[PDB]
Subunit: 206 residues, 6 copies
């Protein structure tokens, strides 16, 4: 098993919670809960980590995804101590440490101001979070590995009042779409990429 | 055969446009366009109305729904005069005047303040518009016939800064879910209900 | 309890077979097979009919639908005699004769020539059969009860080279959409309507 | 306005829990939790009941369904007393006592032994619970109103080792499909029907 | 950003239009409009191209896809001058020229005559375009990169009267399924592969 | 064309049949039929194999999948002689022999005893076969190439009374989830991996 991504979110922000409540297949997170996300290869082996975390802690799983190649587990609890114990149990099962994850790589990042009404339509049709209106500012981010998109979303939301349009935290690449005012989006993007730049991990230049 | 609902929306507001862009099966509406919605029985006969409107005007259809019993067509254009011409062409084909529609009946209307986070989750999972967060105020409206829900949504959005969560404008009953601050929701609800109460039509008692 | 619709189709035509192969949940029909369709209330009791037919004949079920109120079973075989035997076994279990079905009621029937390209789009998005192009002729039919729509489709296809766009043979109402040239559609519509008008049954007024 | 169905399930059995975990849109139930289900008209007004229950108790909602006409809410908790308190809060908001519900009506009930492999296929394609194999015994039940189907499922599972194939507890009618051995299904069916026949309520004739 | 595919379609043919009207998520194309398709890596960055094209021209976007790795944008207009200006704006944003695209590679190509009725069933179940019947001829094509499948479909349709069954113009590989008569399919395949062979671009031998 | 996987299943076991009846897009298999599965690259070329098998034998196709990169065909018949003739026809078309397939590789394999109720929920939500309950034992297997998962499932089911929860026999990797008692799962896993270890084929160490 290879550790691809590992992140602890100290407190889930309300828009990310509402988004996860929309798309998650397990037990629903609630506002301000702590969360840990672990992405590994091979995919189906993530079930071993879920079992390790559940037998060790009272965390509940919100997301478990076995996709084309990779596997992702998200677990949450009111108490950060429980979420960190769950992460510890999963890392122990892997024989790994936190820094054995891949360092996040920003593949693509752009702020698009004054979006055309035809492009807001395309985003609205695709997204599962909030809607966007013509003339607002759009932030798009693509990251590798995918598991770091949730951290980027949560840190964006902490930093400025923006709208979470879509976050995809599994796949070959992770993706984030935000909408809002120009100044607010610039601050949110600053915070999201700053959070990713500060993480330890294996070289991942692609 | 029967005209159930007829409404002209003078200018589509941005959240209702974003919602319609998400759920519509035809040609996408844009902000501030005019729109006309016509609901009839029997369902498949709405195709006759669509043909009449398209041959007479430049309007484009956003929604055509043939559901269990009823049929709904929505047409839009930049020009209110084109939209009223489309509506008039459809009324003419049906053999009706606007006042032969059913008068809207408010089946249920309620404001729920300070929603619990578990109910926020339920709404987020169901809706196709914006998301709602714990502690916000929810407005819920059920109307008969269903085709009046869009007018209610548009007039609510004009009146106050609220979030459009979900609007269902076809079926046995039409339904509207809005979210936001308490004072804003109270104003939006007054505007929605006032719009429905001012419409002429045939007596439509439960 | 009630026999709503009963039809034996002597030979399934190729476009109707291709459509049924697209939407059916059971065992796929093939070209020129015979078929029997039975619609009853209450819905779940159609399972009793299916069991009776399967224990008595070699027929295979293509469709079994238990919808809001009603239940539909379609069975097919290379041999018309097996299919009539299956239908007879189902009628016997129900306690009925063929003529205890509801006589078909044409709710609406219309030919629309020279369809606008915007209406072609609406039909293409909705349908599960062939596509339609701008300027072609559309036939739309609504029948009650719904289970007679398949007979209408099959007889239409026998009579003229048309395109089967959509046929809905369960629900509160049955619906048929055909496309093609004007003369061809006129002949297909005559054949569909004539097939329904020739069927015995209980008076079924609106 | 109307109370249609009201049931308290003292302890959710493991197959019904696994089924609800598959289809529910809210917070997942767990084995042996208590549950209360309330079905009303009009549909959207179920949101008022959900709010009343959440503000009064610790119960969590598993299902909230606003369908064509009706609304259903299911709430659960480890403690039967919390669940009865939630039900009482909802009855109070509605203005009702438990006995103002509609008495359950068995629309259809049948055991089909030795199912044909073609019918096993049809059931497997439709269901969301366990699978059924050729030659097993099938129990089918249709009840009115729909909200009583869950009680029937839970009591069936308590009484005998059977397989829960499908339970539909909202709509115009509620439906239950069970599979297993002949003697086991006979005992489960007796328990389901006995549970429904023992409930007080308003006369509910067809 | 890497330019993978670039194609200008001078006039969209009616079956391809009907297909795109079925599957597209944006603004619907119409018969005989011009279209430009651009496929790039990384996926989410296609939003930058969409914005560039929309701010420069009056083209409307029919398809915007962000898939596992790649991104695709399609834009159309009545006037080829607008579509070519949109392509120019997108290429300018990329710092690229048309010949910086990958040359198309035919991965697999086959004509299958007299298809068996069991194989026409499989195709009918999968496809989103027209249906196929037993005994007709099938053309299957797989191309790399995927973005060239639309050009192949449009040129096929120009060349001979065939049926467009399915075209997949994004992914790791693009795919095309056509049905019809043997002579017509042979001509359509000739035209489709001839169009791909004539395009400039980077060596792409795989 | 490259032969990736080739397996003949002498007799399909009842749970695998019920699963295939749930997910298959072609002609439904029945209990104890023989089956052959062939996986190749490139994807769309699997249509050539389907045509070869159908023109040579009376087998019927249950599954035909053209996924991101690969193609899979499954064909079945009551008589193993017909299924082996179909496999022979497909291998002859490829110019291949059975041992030209990739040898199966077990990527990941684990037995998880006493599963937590939160993890049984996650499995129940994901799966298409039988349900799993809290405290049961889970077997998870990931294999490469994907086409060998069906053989593993069938051999597991022969070996011990277990529950087939999910089997994914196409993709980059094949996956199998089983549930049941600890001793039964250990025997089923033994049989599944033993079957894969005994197959000839090209070196496939990954």
């Amino acid at each position: 098993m290879e550790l691809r991504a590992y992140t602890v979110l100290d407190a889930l922000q309300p828009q990310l919670v509402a988004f996860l409540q929309t798309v998650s297949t397990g037990f629903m997170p609630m506002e301000q809960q702590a969360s840990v996300l672990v992405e590994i290869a091979p995919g189906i082996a993530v079930n071993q980590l879920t079992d390790a975390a559940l037998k060790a802690t009272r965390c509940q799983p919100g997301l478990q995804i076995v996709e084309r190649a990779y596997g992702l587990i998200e677990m949450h609890d009111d108490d950060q101590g429980q979420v960190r114990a769950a992460g510890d149990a999963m890392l122990a099962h892997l024989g790994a440490r936190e820094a054995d994850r891949l360092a996040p790589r920003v593949v693509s990042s752009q702020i698009i101001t004054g979006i055309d009404g035809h492009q807001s339509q395309l985003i609205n049709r695709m997204r599962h979070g909030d809607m966007i209106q013509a003339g607002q500012t759009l932030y798009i981010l693509e990251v590798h590995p995918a598991g770091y998109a949730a951290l980027a979303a949560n840190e964006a939301e902490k930093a400025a009042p923006i709208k979470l349009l879509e976050v995809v935290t599994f796949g070959a690449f992770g993706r984030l779409w935000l909408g809002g005012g120009e100044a607010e989006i610039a601050e949110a993007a600053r915070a999201a990429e700053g959070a990713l730049a500060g993480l330890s991990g294996r070289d991942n230049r692609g």
